[PDB]
Nucleic acid binder design. Structure first.
Lengths: 147, 197
RNA sequence: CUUAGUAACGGCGAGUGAAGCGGCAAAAGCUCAAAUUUGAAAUCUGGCGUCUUCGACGUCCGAGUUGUAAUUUGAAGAAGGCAACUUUGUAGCUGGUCCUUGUCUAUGUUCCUUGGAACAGGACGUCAUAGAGGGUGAGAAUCCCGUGUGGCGAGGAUCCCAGUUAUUUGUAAAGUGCUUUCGACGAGUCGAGUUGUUUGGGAAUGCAGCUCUAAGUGGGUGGUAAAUUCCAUCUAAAGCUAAAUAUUGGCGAGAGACCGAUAGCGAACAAGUACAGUGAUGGAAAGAUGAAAAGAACUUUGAAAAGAGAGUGAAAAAGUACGUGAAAUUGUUGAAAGGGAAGGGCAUUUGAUCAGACAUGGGCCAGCAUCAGUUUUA
RNA sequence: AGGAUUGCGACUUUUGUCAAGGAUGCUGGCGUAAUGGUUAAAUGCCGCCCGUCUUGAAACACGGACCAAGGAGUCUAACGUCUAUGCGAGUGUUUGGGUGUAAAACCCGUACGCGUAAUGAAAGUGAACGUAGGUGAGGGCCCGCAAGGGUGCAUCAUCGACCGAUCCUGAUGUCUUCGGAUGGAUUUGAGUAAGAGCAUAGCUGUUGGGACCCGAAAGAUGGUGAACUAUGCCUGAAUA
RNA sequence: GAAAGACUAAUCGAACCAUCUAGUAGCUGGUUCCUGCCGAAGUUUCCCUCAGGAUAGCAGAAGCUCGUAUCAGUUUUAUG
RNA sequence: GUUGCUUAAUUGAACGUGGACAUUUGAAUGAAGAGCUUUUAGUGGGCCAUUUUUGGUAAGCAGAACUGGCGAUGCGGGAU
RNA sequence: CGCUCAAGCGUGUUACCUAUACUCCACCGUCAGGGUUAAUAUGAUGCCCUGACGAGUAGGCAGGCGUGGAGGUCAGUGACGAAGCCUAGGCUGUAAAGCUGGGUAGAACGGCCUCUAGUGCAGAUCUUGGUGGUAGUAGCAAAUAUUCAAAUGAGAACUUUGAAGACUGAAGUGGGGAAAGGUUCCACGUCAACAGCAGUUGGACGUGGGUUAGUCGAUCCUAAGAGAUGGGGAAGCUCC
RNA sequence: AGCCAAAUGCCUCGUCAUCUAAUUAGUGACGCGCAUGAAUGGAUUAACGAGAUUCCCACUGUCCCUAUCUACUAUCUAGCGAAACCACAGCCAAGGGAACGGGCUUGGCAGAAUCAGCGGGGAAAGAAGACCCUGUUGAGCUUGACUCUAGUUUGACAUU
RNA sequence: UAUCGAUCCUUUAGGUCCUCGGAAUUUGAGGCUAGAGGUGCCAGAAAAGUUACCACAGGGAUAACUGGCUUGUGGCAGUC
RNA sequence: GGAUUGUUCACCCACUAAUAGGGAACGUGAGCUGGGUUUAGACCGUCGUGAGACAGGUUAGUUUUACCCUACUGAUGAAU
RNA sequence: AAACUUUCAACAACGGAUCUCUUGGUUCUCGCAUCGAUGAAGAACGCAGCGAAUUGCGAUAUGUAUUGUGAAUUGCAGAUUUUCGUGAAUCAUCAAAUCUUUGAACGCACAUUGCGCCCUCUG
């Protein structure tokens, strides 16, 4: 919409929202991040920090593939099991018939502790696990199989 | 040049970018060219499908090893296992790949079943006289789909034995870090200096 | 399409910046050198002759043994022995298919008003798998060309398919089970040092010059320089190949919430033209009478151009200095004012000119009295 | 001014009356250029020429003889706050495929982006002592005739708990040098504590782009000129 | 160039013609319709900063949680 | 009451449990609603007056302090 | 201007003049605080009540007026006259503007709800095109010089013939060529423009006619120079 | 060695002599000469000079001191017919004001339309100051400024 | 109450530490935590002249000429 | 009235009644002149390694347009 | 009082804005692959009954032959009768020919319509 803008409304006045003294010239400061250490230090000391310099060490030929491992909290856990088979499983599984939850098929690396799960045997399969995550599962009844 | 409280952007437009711009106006028209091309090819070929029959293959890396996918060609070992030559297979609508190898009994069986299912369902016309035509099925992928292998038992026993999965990972990882120096510490003390004794 | 404005690069400042996997479009694979046909250079150019002439057959010189055919290419493969055999090929004729084309296939010009002219308005119909667009004296489905639906020819391309007819390939060409011996693989190259250049490539990504110069379980790579020991992966230093992808040039077709003659290409017109420069080059302006030229016969004034009349036409307030014909700027007539400028604002007066509910039966302008609100003066 | 009545009152023996929440009554003239409207001149008083840079312009500061048409914050790639819309721990059909009355409209789903977890340079590890904790304030609701008591979301302040880094402590065990139990610390993070985001569209602001419009002295690449004039060579001519 | 920075097609202290090129400018000039409401600054710190920017201050808009609060460019008593 | 602080201590110090005292919410005056958050414009050459005041013989000169004006502002008066 | 026991100077006591300031009333807008469809026609965005305030450059936000195209809708208007243009006619709005009478003219164009932009000009020593004052003015003065009749013609200071005066004075206003131009040479017709006065004349305009070589030139030879080939450079255009 | 207040001397119009009635000039001597001087050439010098400077003779409207004449313009008429410039225009004095008004303020005043002249004003026209300063804008020339480079020269390896 | 210094680079101290991404061992290089090598234009570029042959963009924010304010100085006149 | 100097100022020789001092955009360049300062040619000295510099000296060097308005000097002239 | 100056209106000038029109532009999509020593692209000079330019063609010169359609061309002439046809036409079509002098340009030269050499027929 060209009619709703403010340049339509400025037709008549001389400066067009830019002042008589300042003038609106081409490039008064510079051209993109120019004079970061000299005359735009007060901007970069505020608001940003840590901009100049270099922390850490280099990685040559890095791949976003070795570093995968998407986490999964124990709050979610039961969402991997279907909705039909839930009111059935929550009321009486009681060993020798526990619902197997393969996390890697859904797309999760490390089973990880946060929530407080109900007292039912689970038998979970996962690549990695936290120390707390195992304590909560054994308190319920189940176990953790590695892959 | 800078200064409010905005994120530092990275816009790479300091070359003559306007001279090398493309706008895809052809998207709609180019779709009809491909649908026309796929249709006109089927008219020339007539009773055969447009696609070659491809095998089932497992994917690489840690990110994608948990899924199966349609490969390139059937290998020379699997083509032999069914009961046919590689030169003959290329003219029946079966893709061959001379460089892929087999190090898995599970994938070896699956693709032998895939060839036997293919050979049974297709018919072949002779070179000489009669040719009893039976329409055309276009997509080979439709009739021969790719299904994910099931390694599942929904309800199952709970066999615990006080091992702790977390403790197993910490011990196993420590062995990889220290087997280098632990071999060399054993090559001294017990060997070299004490084999001299 | 994602990876990613990421891993790296950079007076680590400004700024620069890939690729693997994953999802799709499209998929097609292959050939030489290095082995002795050695019980028969088996191969090929040209000349001369004859035929069904993009060729085929026969014959005579030449090329070539310092290597032309057949045979084999690392996925293999060859030479022997044992063993079962499943396959075959080359012309033209007609038809379809694909192009270039030509022709055929519905329905009112009925009545009345306006007009120079119906293609306008009103009344009554007709056709519709045709109410896209254009033409005709003003907005036409039905006046004309077309459009829609489907027929019917002609002339090329021909192997893409289908169906036939000759042939006549064969004792030769191909494929596969077992077992024994072998299994030829590209050099001033690979690789190393050094200089210059380039990349995201960091003790050096590729390329090039110069000096050094290999190997046979060998050589290359595995993104930090070395020495030592393993593992995983391919086989360089010779070569061919459709498709998905590009396209401000050329030849042929469609469209547009684009411009409407100071716009849009420099150019809607005899435009790269007229014209300028020694020369490389530079480079304009300029569209519209009327439906039809019916483009003004004839008289009279004038040396003539033209003028007055007349005449054409719906109109000459359309006369080829032509549709409409604004402003600056000028002439004539009318009204007003004017003692070193004019031109404005508030308020009257005079002069000009102009809207607005006294019409049915035949509002405008003031004055006095008693009150309310605000004040003033004795 | 207003446009039925409603109110406060006063005077009334009473009904009623009234100067009491804003003007009614009676009369005359004319009914049209008379009153008003615009327009031109005259008379009284007042009035410097606009636009612009500037502490300051009528300026002896700059641009402006006059008229017509043209003529200047636009579009895009990444973005920030606010606002509307749809779905909501999810969200996004449109690279591509299927269809079609054909660039439209309609339908389809693997992936993939962002979000659901952080902190470290990295190796890595990875969020409940307790009603997801107490204290002070808190809208609203609940009990009560009230006084007051109960329950207290959002949010603000404040002291604790939990996860990561940092610095100490170093239990049972054990390839005798690995392993890290438990307990701590004037340290420290863009964390957890009954999730809020993703997509489209709009005004305003940002950075790259010709970047609101016109304006240099320069620099670089590839070409054309000795008919003027500078100098040498070859061949001619001219000077009482 | 018998020397004046002379002449080199009216062009010379570095010719002319096209292209890169819409070269860059902290500097000059311009920047197109009405009413309505609010209404500034020329000051602090840093800068090859002094005809210029960043940063705070002043201004507008959008509002959110509440509803007489613990407030005031002021006075008084006490006390520095 | 609370403790690993502190005490010769059964003391102290912080944060508390329950309890007593609301006309007289413990000076005056006013209150135009109070508190708070995000975002972005222009500006960053200033100048004059009354007192205080430094340099200078002095200046319609230069440079500070406290309020008020002009700049951004017409209107009545100072003839202008 | 003029003023002298003031119309001067110092002081006192009254009246009177007067700002967009102050008080009161009418109307406009903005902001706040209320009341109301309880069937009760017409806009709940409605219809009322009460109170305060109004200057403003740079700047910000709000509500409207107009221009060119796109989707919808008034079965809108129109050759019985659409658009445009002119008008000391009229009506509405604070205004941007809109509606309408009279004239001119001869084919298309409006309102209301939305979409969209190459969307509004007085200035830029702005760009292109046109026209003024200045002004019937500056001026049309160097190369010694013209005069009298006759003819043609509508028309003669300027053309053709006669007569008289003059000049260049043979290093010339004479007779021929080179470079360069290209029909300007020559005849017949004829004056719209050009010949800065005029025009019957013309190097103008219209239509034709005209350049004859064995011996004059070019052609042929070489000059200062230029320039293939055989060769050698250079990625190459090409260089020696 | 020479030469001089010299085209080289600041203090200066140097001091002495001569030319004139009178000379910041001219010529001749003097010289601790701001800062003369020997092929970055010193001193002298016949002829020559559209070179610079002083005086004398003759000559004259340069001057005391202006006057007169001739042609061609201007002037008037017939015909033909432009440009620069221009916000709007054109009477003065004082005041205040961006400190020197043609317009504002207070006085003087003020009469159609016009023609020759003229240079007092219009801070009159000409050209986005060339002098001066500023710009983080340039170019020409110079050099022990900073970083390079063709050419040349020395050494090593190849040609061997 | 004064006596001094970022990024990047080099360097030293410290730890039974982390990394060289096909797997190991030793050298080597790269990281994590604190010092030193200096920017005096001291919130920190690496930098010599000249133009009278000159150029462009601007400036009365700023000199050389008048005019105005001022009168030390110059000039003229009083007082005891 | 004259000598010298581009001069303002200065210093002399005479005459004379006397040879007083000043202003008017430091009056007066579309009124003249161009000796001076003040561009480019060139020479000398001091200074500079050099290009060049010198409030040192010396010589050669471009002075445009009125026809308009007012002003002044003269000259006609409608209407009582 | 006129003339003269200034403002307005009607008619007439000057000039070409405004309004309506449009065989041209600009962008986007879709299809196809074809220049030349058999002499190309470009250049000069010619050709019509009456043409200067533009449009066509090359001394066979606004074209010839071949095929299709079936009566024109038109500013003014003029035919031809070809008009129940092996045929009008500035028509469409296009497969046989012509193609001046040049140009990559080719006998050697080329500010020249310059100068040679070989085979062959006729004077």
């Amino acid at each position: 919409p060209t009619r709703l803008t403010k340049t339509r409304k400025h037709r008549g006045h001389v400066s067009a929202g830019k002042g008589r003294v300042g003038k609106h010239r081409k490039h008064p400061g510079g051209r993109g991040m120019a004079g970061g250490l000299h005359h735009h230090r007060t901007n970069l000391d505020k608001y940003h920090p840590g901009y100049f310099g270099k922390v850490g060490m280099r990685y040559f030929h890095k791949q976003q593939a070795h570093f995968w491992k998407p986490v999964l909290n124990l709050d979610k856990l039961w969402t991997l099991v279907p909705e039909e088979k839930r009111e059935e499983y929550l009321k009486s599984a009681s060993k020798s018939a526990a619902p197997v939850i393969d996390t890697l098929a859904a797309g999760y690396g490390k089973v990880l502790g946060k929530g407080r799960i109900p007292d039912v045997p689970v038998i979970v399969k996962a690549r990695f696990v936290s120390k707390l995550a195992e304590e909560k599962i054994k308190a319920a009844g189940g176990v953790v199989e590695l892959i | 040049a800078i200064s409010k409280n905005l994120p530092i952007l990275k816009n790479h437009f300091r070359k003559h970018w306007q001279e090398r711009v493309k706008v895809h106006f052809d998207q709609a028209g180019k779709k009809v060219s491909r649908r026309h091309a796929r249709a006109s090819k089927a008219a020339k070929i007539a009773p055969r499908p447009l696609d070659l029959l491809r095998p089932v293959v497992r994917a690489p890396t840690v990110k994608y090893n948990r899924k199966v996918r349609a490969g390139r060609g059937f290998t020379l070992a699997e083509i032999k296992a069914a009961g046919l030559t590689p030169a003959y297979a290329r003219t029946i609508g079966i893709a061959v790949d001379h460089r892929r190898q087999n190090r898995n009994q599970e994938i070896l069986d699956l693709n032998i079943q895939r060839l036997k299912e293919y050979q049974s369902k297709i018919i072949v016309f002779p070179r000489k006289g009669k040719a009893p035509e039976a329409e055309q099925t276009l997509s080979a992928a439709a009739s021969f789909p790719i299904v994910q292998p099931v390694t599942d038992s929904e309800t199952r026993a709970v066999e615990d034995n006080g091992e702790s999965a977390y403790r197993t990972l910490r011990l196993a990882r420590s062995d990889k870090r220290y087997k280098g120096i632990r071999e060399k510490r054993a090559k001294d003390k017990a060997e070299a200096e004490a084999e001299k004794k």
